[PDB]
């Protein structure tokens, strides 16, 4: 089926009263005054797409003759997309898109749009039209550095961002300081004043990344134990995964070692290990980031290099990068039993384009971030509603069916998605570090691990051709989505369903209303329905309810039926058609030991997995 | 009796057990093993006369081979001043004069020294040859003029620097910010970022000065603000006239709490903003009092410049980006038979500002900017030490007019000569740069203090006159704390009465030991360390115990007037406690209030025992 066939399924479902609480709430813009400028999805849609289609104003393949035409065209296109919810960009787009604008061209019917009016829309985009999530920034070994670095916080902060910094630079706590009376205070100490800056610059979550050889690891393992409530932590493996779990089967020793001090330690890796574990079976951190990993498949590496996340840990970005996110929600392109290739693959082209777009009309803070993002183009393109695509078509979360599924429709999108990006290097010019890139200087590199799907050989196609024509960096992504999806009314991410029910309460002038999942309403007699929805809600779970067939039960599992390795496993599915990093809290029972997380992180450790969060029921 | 005279009396005096522990302990410098390259006060003095001596380099009106000659006349008496002990400059210039210098020279024998030696000391000073103890640092509007002053705070305290800062410009908690979905933290949320900056800059800490205005929407948040900002001072900026609020006082009026960028407002009562002040002050000694207005008055630059802040210690108003530059005259060496001994005073005054100046020139700044406001104003801070000292040899009570009227025209006659000296070294050497925007040229008649309690008084209008044509210095005095520099001289600090007669910080009176009779000491030394005061220790002559007053046996009006004396003839600040027994009340902080409005201090400092 063609994609508008499926945006006229799509695009007059209206969002549920769930979804508009939250848009009316966030999203919806508002006057001066408090007042709404919008009161429906359909104005967010056409704000979002009329600026994000101004960026084809740029197009060098675009004769000053057509730029009307054309631009009306992709406004069209990104406007049905949108409205449909088949697609949706990340939350700062919506909040921030057409800020500075005058208020009569935003909204004005598209068939009284001037070529005037678009490039006037292009021109007033003020300071606050910042329009990414998420940003990586360097902290240089020096007083200066340091607080240049917190003032870039601060400033990324104030504009929306979430930021990450790999702290391994700053020279352990105690070490010599030549211009200086002081001893150097250490990492986790000056972290404190980047907790400090985020506590008092307000928005209506940061990454801290210490590596694991620093001689301080021990101190920002258990760094946030009572602060740094604003940070989420992260172990970092900068060497090969290989080389961890081979030092960790040998009950070696690692050497903890800072180029600017005179500080080391010896500990066993072991050691160490049961201490992250501890500590995250505890309070669900510190997570890992295997650098190492990400930097194995960097087109950049070694010119560039991935020094740190961003708070959620799904994009490895270099200094003054910034996430470019958006999502397709798969569960709407579920067509009798089969998922619709043919409409998804017509979306993926559409949303490539419009994301790199929101490069062109996005104004960034610094100017270091203008600049590193200008030069590579790195998107993020992924999926939401997945869990609930695997319960239309009855898959079991816990399978290995759901798992290859998974990774079939992973490397359909990233073919697709590259396909796309080689389309557009051609049309509008490739990314300016493609020279330098590995995509030109060398034979077969895939930016990702595949050897799960039979569409790999048409993707080293793609990667080869690739050499030529290339607009983006990278691709894809697997953000956690949780805003996003529930404008779209489907599951996040890749994530399963946490609860099938669960109770919200509307607030009037209190009084309790019960949701339940929409595809089990859907699959189940409203008849047995009735009867278990209580105690479904009681027990968050179907597995032990008596008179509920055998395979409603094994199909609409939620996550903590699903156990810490098919958790763990469907990662790696995407993760091999993923040329970013991937969401993936890894689950475990209330019951589970510091042992079965070590047994997480072993295995994370031989999965194609670029990190790992494991959050513990009732820690 | 002439300062050479003076000299060879004090010169050979060693420092005591005291002083030695200090300096050993903070003062010594040491090589990069820990050893010591200094073991005694001489090297100390050596070493900084030497290197301050070195900005005679780039004097204009020394020729050629009268260049060496003359810079070694200078090191010559620097020395010897500084090992006498007669002036000594603040302690960052005993810390860190000849940071980066090969050893070998710091301690030459002068007789040995070549220009190429002192051009190679000019040229090595490193980037910790940091000789001020404090700057002021605006704070913009913005999150990047905040978060740029935070690097700022970092950056001086790095180097040892204290910092004041005055944050009223900060949009009040809860305002419309154009640049964010957010609403302004206020100027009270985002000092909690100083103060963690501040927390994790190290020097072996800082201290900071945090000004809210009265009339800031957020003062009472910042009045009970340290009710964390532990390493903050807070006071209360007055940037009106006194005379205005005072009235404002008596009228029982109401102030309007307002910020020009955003829209909360309030009004509230005089009255009650003073209460809740002295409350808080009568409590925890915190918040003091900044008579901005006043400092601005007397500001020669004012309004192209303006005061917006003090430093730590309150004792130097001090413009965007400029410098404490600080050194003290221990007065109690200049007893000379029931009198102060002019003559010799007269010629280091005169020396101290040359010193002074000379710090300017051979000081590494940590910004670009304070370089830049320092070079342009030339601010010196020359104040006093042993002036309690001084009283008890000269016999004259603390808390008595007599003392007050002996302090003002000490005061006149120190800021005679070194304002001359200025003078005389604008010739020498060049003016300020902004000599020709500033008060002193456009205008006529302009003072930079009171006056109004000195026979000096004529010859100062005379003085400043004559500085339309020639003016090294924007201002030159301050009377500043001077804890370390007084131990280290062994005198009594600043303007400040002695705390103890007797204590442990040890450490008995030298005056006292002098006059009180022998044995008639031992048979009291028990009870004066108990007791804290002279005042109720049968048989001791009445007269023993007026003139050996200490802090606490001078009430709260005395205190203030003797900064009222000393304020009329200092161009900067004064650094002064008002001691309050613990039987004070909030009334009583509230009446030393007022009586500030109505003296000519420039803020306010007080302290009650026990709190
Ligand atoms: N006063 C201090 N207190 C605590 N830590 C400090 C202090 N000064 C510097 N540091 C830390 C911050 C960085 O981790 C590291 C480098 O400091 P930096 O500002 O580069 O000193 P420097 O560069 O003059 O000396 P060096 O040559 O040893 O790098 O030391
Ligand atoms: N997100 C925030 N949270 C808390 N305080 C903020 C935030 N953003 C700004 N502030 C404070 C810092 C300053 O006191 C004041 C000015 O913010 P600023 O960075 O100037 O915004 P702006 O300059 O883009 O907006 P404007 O055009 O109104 O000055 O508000
Ligand atoms: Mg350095
Ligand atoms: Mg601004």
Same mark, same amino acid.
């Given at each position: 089926?063609?994609?508008?066939?499926?945006?006229?399924?799509?695009?007059?479902?209206?969002?549920?009263?769930?979804?508009?609480?939250?848009?009316?709430?966030?999203?919806?813009?508002?006057?001066?005054?408090?007042?709404?400028?919008?009161?429906?999805?359909?104005?967010?849609?056409?704000?979002?797409?009329?600026?994000?289609?101004?960026?084809?104003?740029?197009?060098?393949?675009?004769?000053?003759?057509?730029?009307?035409?054309?631009?009306?065209?992709?406004?069209?296109?990104?406007?049905?997309?949108?409205?449909?919810?088949?697609?949706?960009?990340?939350?700062?787009?919506?909040?921030?898109?057409?800020?500075?604008?005058?208020?009569?061209?935003?909204?004005?019917?598209?068939?009284?749009?001037?070529?005037?009016?678009?490039?006037?829309?292009?021109?007033?985009?003020?300071?606050?039209?910042?329009?990414?999530?998420?940003?990586?920034?360097?902290?240089?070994?020096?007083?200066?550095?340091?607080?240049?670095?917190?003032?870039?916080?601060?400033?990324?902060?104030?504009?929306?961002?979430?930021?990450?910094?790999?702290?391994?630079?700053?020279?352990?706590?105690?070490?010599?300081?030549?211009?200086?009376?002081?001893?150097?205070?250490?990492?986790?100490?000056?972290?404190?004043?980047?907790?400090?800056?985020?506590?008092?610059?307000?928005?209506?979550?940061?990454?801290?990344?210490?590596?694991?050889?620093?001689?301080?690891?021990?101190?920002?393992?258990?760094?946030?134990? !009572?602060?740094?409530?604003?940070?989420?932590?992260?172990?970092?493996?900068?060497?090969?995964?290989?080389?961890?779990?081979?030092?960790?089967?040998?009950?070696?020793?690692?050497?903890?070692?800072?180029?600017?001090?005179?500080?080391?330690?010896?500990?066993?890796?072991?050691?160490?290990?049961?201490?992250?574990?501890?500590?995250?079976?505890?309070?669900?951190?510190?997570?890992?980031?295997?650098?190492?990993?990400?930097?194995?498949?960097?087109?950049?590496?070694?010119?560039?290099?991935?020094?740190?996340?961003?708070?959620?840990?799904?994009?490895?970005?270099?200094?003054?990068?910034?996430?470019?996110?958006?999502?397709?929600?798969?569960?709407?392109?579920?067509?009798?039993?089969?998922?619709?290739?043919?409409?998804?693959?017509?979306?993926?082209?559409?949303?490539?384009?419009?994301?790199?777009?929101?490069?062109?009309?996005?104004?960034?803070?610094?100017?270091?971030?203008?600049?590193?993002?200008?030069?590579?183009?790195?998107?993020?393109?992924?999926?939401?509603?997945?869990?609930?695509?695997?319960?239309?078509?009855?898959?079991?979360?816990?399978?290995?069916?759901?798992?290859?599924?998974?990774?079939?429709?992973?490397?359909?999108?990233?073919?697709?998605?590259?396909?796309?990006?080689?389309?557009?290097?051609?049309?509008?010019?490739?990314?300016?570090?493609?020279?330098?890139?590995?995509?030109?200087?060398?034979?077969?590199?895939?930016?990702?691990?595949?050897?799960?799907?039979?569409?790999?050989?048409?993707?080293?196609?793609?990667?080869?051709?690739?050499?030529?024509?290339?607009?983006?960096?990278?691709?894809?992504?697997?953000?956690?989505?949780?805003?996003?999806?529930?404008?779209?009314?489907?599951?996040?991410?890749?994530?399963?369903?946490?609860?099938?029910?669960?109770?919200?309460?509307?607030?009037?002038?209190?009084?309790?209303?019960?949701?339940?999942?929409?595809?089990?309403?859907?699959?189940?007699?409203?008849?047995?329905?009735?009867?278990?929805?209580? !105690?479904?809600?009681?027990?968050?779970?179907?597995?032990?309810?008596?008179?509920?067939?055998?395979?409603?039960?094994?199909?609409?599992?939620?996550?903590?039926?699903?156990?810490?390795?098919?958790?763990?496993?469907?990662?790696?599915?995407?993760?091999?058609?993923?040329?970013?990093?991937?969401?993936?809290?890894?689950?475990?029972?209330?019951?589970?030991?510091?042992?079965?997380?070590?047994?997480?992180?072993?295995?994370?450790?031989?999965?194609?997995?670029?990190?790992?969060?494991?959050?513990?029921?009732?820690?």
């Amino acid at each position: 089926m063609k994609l508008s066939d499926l945006i006229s399924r799509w695009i007059d479902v209206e969002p549920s009263k769930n979804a508009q609480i939250i848009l009316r709430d966030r999203y919806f813009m508002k006057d001066l005054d408090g007042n709404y400028l919008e009161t429906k999805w359909e104005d967010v849609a056409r704000r979002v797409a009329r600026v994000v289609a101004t960026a084809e104003l740029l197009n060098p393949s675009y004769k000053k003759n057509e730029k009307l035409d054309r631009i009306k065209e992709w406004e069209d296109i990104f406007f049905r997309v949108l409205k449909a919810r088949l697609f949706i960009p990340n939350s700062p787009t919506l909040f921030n898109a057409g800020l500075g604008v005058k208020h009569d061209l935003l909204w004005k019917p598209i068939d009284q749009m001037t070529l005037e009016d678009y490039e006037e829309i292009y021109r007033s985009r003020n300071h606050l039209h910042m329009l990414s999530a998420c940003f990586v920034v360097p902290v240089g070994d020096s007083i200066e550095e340091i607080f240049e670095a917190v003032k870039e916080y601060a400033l990324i902060t104030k504009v929306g961002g979430g930021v990450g910094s790999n702290f391994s630079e700053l020279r352990p706590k105690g070490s010599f300081v030549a211009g200086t009376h002081g001893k150097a205070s250490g990492p986790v100490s000056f972290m404190h004043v980047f907790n400090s800056a985020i506590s008092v610059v307000k928005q209506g979550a940061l990454m801290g990344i210490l590596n694991i050889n620093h001689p301080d690891i021990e101190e920002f393992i258990d760094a946030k134990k !009572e602060v740094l409530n604003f940070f989420n932590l992260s172990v970092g493996f900068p060497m090969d995964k290989k080389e961890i779990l081979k030092l960790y089967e040998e009950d070696g020793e690692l050497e903890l070692s800072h180029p600017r001090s005179t500080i080391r330690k010896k500990v066993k890796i072991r050691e160490l290990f049961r201490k992250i574990a501890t500590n995250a079976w505890k309070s669900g951190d510190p997570g890992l980031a295997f650098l190492g990993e990400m930097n194995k498949y960097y087109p950049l590496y070694p010119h560039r290099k991935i020094n740190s996340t961003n708070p959620c840990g799904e994009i490895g970005l270099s200094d003054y990068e910034a996430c470019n996110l958006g999502s397709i929600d798969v569960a709407k392109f579920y067509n009798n039993g089969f998922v619709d290739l043919e409409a998804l693959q017509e979306l993926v082209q559409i949303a490539v384009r419009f994301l790199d777009n929101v490069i062109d009309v996005n104004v960034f803070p610094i100017d270091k971030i203008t600049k590193a993002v200008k030069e590579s183009r790195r998107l993020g393109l992924g999926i939401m509603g997945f869990a609930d695509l695997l319960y239309k078509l009855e898959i079991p979360y816990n399978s290995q069916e759901a798992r290859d599924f998974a990774a079939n429709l992973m490397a359909f999108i990233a073919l697709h998605a590259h396909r796309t990006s080689y389309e557009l290097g051609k049309e509008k010019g490739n990314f300016p570090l493609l020279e330098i890139s590995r995509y030109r200087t060398e034979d077969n590199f895939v930016p990702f691990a595949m050897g799960m799907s039979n569409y790999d050989d048409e993707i080293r196609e793609v990667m080869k051709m690739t050499k030529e024509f290339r607009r983006n960096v990278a691709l894809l992504t697997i953000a956690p989505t949780g805003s996003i999806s529930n404008i779209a009314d489907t599951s996040s991410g890749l994530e399963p369903n946490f609860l099938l029910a669960y109770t919200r309460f509307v607030t009037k002038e209190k009084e309790p209303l019960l949701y339940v999942n929409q595809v089990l309403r859907e699959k189940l007699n409203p008849e047995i329905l009735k009867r278990i929805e209580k !105690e479904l809600i009681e027990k968050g779970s179907l597995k032990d309810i008596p008179d509920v067939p055998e395979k409603i039960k094994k199909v609409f599992v939620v996550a903590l039926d699903i156990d810490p390795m098919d958790h763990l496993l469907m990662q790696d599915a995407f993760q091999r058609y993923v040329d970013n990093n991937i969401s993936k809290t890894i689950n475990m029972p209330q019951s589970a030991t510091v042992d079965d997380v070590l047994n997480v992180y072993l295995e994370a450790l031989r999965t194609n997995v670029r990190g790992i969060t494991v959050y513990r029921d009732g820690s």
